[PDB]
Write a protein that binds this ligand. Structure first.
Ligand SMILES: Cc1ncn(-c2nc3c(C(=O)N[C@@H](c4ccc(OC(F)(F)F)cc4)C(C)(C)O)cnn3cc2C)n1
Ligand SMILES: Cc1ncn(-c2nc3c(C(=O)N[C@@H](c4ccc(OC(F)(F)F)cc4)C(C)(C)O)cnn3cc2C)n1
Ligand SMILES: [Mg+2]
Ligand SMILES: [Mg+2]
Ligand SMILES: [Mg+2]
Ligand SMILES: [Zn+2]
Ligand SMILES: [Zn+2]
Lengths: 313, 338
């Protein structure tokens, strides 16, 4: 188990981009993060079992453009950053933070690059079921020495956290999140623990928006590749895809800016309200959104297309 | 010799044999293969009776036509097929508007020959570029204005004074000078700057009515007709206007690239990173092309269909303007362009 500092001197910073790490080093980085959070010693996790678990989780991701292992790794890395930078131990129990990290690793398992509509929370229930199947694969149960009580806690936490990655769920609990942010977190309120875990999970899921322009632009490319692939499949089946899935109707600037203003930014705003040290995350999302507005004009073709042809009219 | 032999040993084809619709405003001369265009030029001159009228030596005319064809380079738009299409339109105006009621035979003959010659040795660059690039043409003509148009005329003169190519060498001294003066004035009228200077005079003439005894009206009409021929790709169907726009913008943006490489700032319409084709195309059509065909309609009621076609093509450009906004990802499948 490599010490975290040996991966990169900036590895525990909010400025670090985990997609910079080559894919063949990510499983070792997962182990290094768990070691640095002390969960291996805390929960007496068998290291061979943990290695097998991590590789099985990695193998349980398919290779669509966005919802692949590197997404899961990047989300898990952000969870680690929240631990290292926001001092989550003042707000959550060790088992809750451990569940959050493991949920991050597992939360999109077996994603096919299609959404719930293409198939409540259909995909998120599947991701959880896949995580369960891995745990019950011989040699991969990292929790098999847990007490009956802690085992059920861990399974309940993982289910609730993975289910919180559905936008529909987030929108249902949004008023409860705002209320908590307003009144202030209460470490003795079990609802506040549950709500905070949901918020943190969504903050990890969307963490590509908190990096530089390069990341938000490149991830947008992967996202729209996935969306439009789904729309193509829907059209081939004879069905009418939503505008954001239809490459002949989708207008990326509008879709991207709306997503950032109305979904991403309010999550990082809430996170800022609960953790002053999360302020730089909200500012980076707002900055990236401003950048999207600035480059919106580039979707209007100036000159001729690269084709050198007006056949498209 | 080979192109000559083919032009000379294929006899002067009657125009009807080229196409049954050859004398119609709906005909697209770019549909004719390039290897048949020289014979078509001869057929048109024969059908307008200029060969018999002026007793033109047919071998000399064949040589002249092939030399003119050879004097065009191959940029995207300003090539022989442009000159041919412009000459064809001049022929259409003769066949459809009865130009013999307005102009002298020598004036109509000069117009057609001017159409053939009017962009000779064009390099796909405009007058401004010649000055900016300090070309040989700028050195020769920049103090006089209309740099390229003076060059086109000089090229036409050089062809006429090439042995075996002087189609006017049996003209009287009076008719020879007249022909050279007409060719100069008509070729100079293809500069947009010239057209914009005379525009108020053209409007005046259109309003008061053409007067066949007014020599200024003859001169103004020839200018208008020449510009009507130069822009005649706008009077055909959507396919032509769209395809010609492609060639035009390729030429414009190639020039802008050269200007940037020289360190200069190109006009927005020459800059592929700033030019917005719908806006440029619609403005050109509304403010340059349509008023020319409006004037032509005012002077010739039978030219009404030309104006209507230009206005219709402009409406089509407005309708497809929205397609210049990228929906989905680019064909590249990449957002690197941001
Ligand atoms: C209306 C709509 N739906 C998705 N949209 C976009 N999503 C994205 C994402 C992203 O990461 N989207 C995931 C996600 C994951 C959890 C989620 O819920 C919660 F609670 F975290 F906000 C919402 C979105 C994804 C791909 C599953 O939609 C990146 N760029 N981008 C652009 C757009 C237009 N817009
Ligand atoms: C301000 C400006 N200048 C040129 N513009 C455009 N020109 C064209 C033409 C065309 O045929 N242009 C020639 C021409 C030739 C004689 C001429 O003078 C006169 F008197 F006939 F109007 C004007 C234009 C060309 C290529 C030489 O500019 C086709 N599409 N198109 C689009 C635009 C935006 N716009
Ligand atoms: Mg998901
Ligand atoms: Mg010209
Ligand atoms: Mg009147
Ligand atoms: Zn995810
Ligand atoms: Zn021309």
């Amino acid at each position: 188990i490599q010490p975290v500092a040996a991966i990169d001197s900036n590895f525990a910073s909010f400025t670090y981009t985990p997609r910079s790490l080559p894919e063949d080093d990510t499983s070792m980085a997962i182990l290094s993060m768990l070691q640095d959070m002390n969960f291996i010693n805390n929960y007496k996790i068998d290291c061979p079992t943990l290695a097998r678990f991590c590789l099985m989780v990695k193998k349980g991701y398919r290779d669509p453009p966005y919802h692949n292992w590197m997404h899961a790794f990047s989300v898990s890395h952000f969870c680690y950053l929240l631990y290292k930078n926001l001092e989550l131990t003042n707000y959550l129990e060790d088992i809750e933070i451990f569940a959050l990290f493991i949920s991050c690793m597992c939360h999109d398992l077996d994603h096919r690059g299609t959404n719930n509509s293409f198939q409540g929370s259909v995909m998120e229930r599947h991701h959880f079921a896949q995580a369960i199947a891995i745990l019950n694969t011989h040699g991969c149960n990292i929790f098999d020495h847990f007490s009956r009580k802690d085992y059920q806690r861990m399974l309940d936490l993982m289910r609730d956290i993975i289910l919180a990655t559905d936008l529909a769920h987030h929108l249902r609990i949004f008023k409860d999140l705002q209320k908590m942010a307003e009144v202030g977190y209460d470490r003795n309120n079990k609802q506040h623990h549950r709500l905070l875990l949901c918020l943190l999970m969504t903050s990890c899921d969307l963490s590509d928006q908190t990096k530089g322009w390069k990341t938000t632009r490149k991830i947008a490319e992967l996202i729209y590749k996935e969306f439009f692939s789904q729309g193509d499949l829907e059209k081939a089946m004879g069905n009418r895809p939503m505008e954001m899935m239809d490459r002949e109707k989708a207008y990326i600037p509008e879709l991207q800016i709306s997503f950032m203003e109305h979904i991403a930014m309010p999550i990082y705003k809430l996170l800022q309200d609960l953790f002053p040290k999360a302020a730089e995350l909200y500012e980076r999302v707002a900055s990236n959104r401003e950048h999207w507005t600035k480059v919106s004009h580039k979707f209007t073709i100036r000159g001729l297309p690269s084709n050198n042809s007006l056949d498209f009219l």
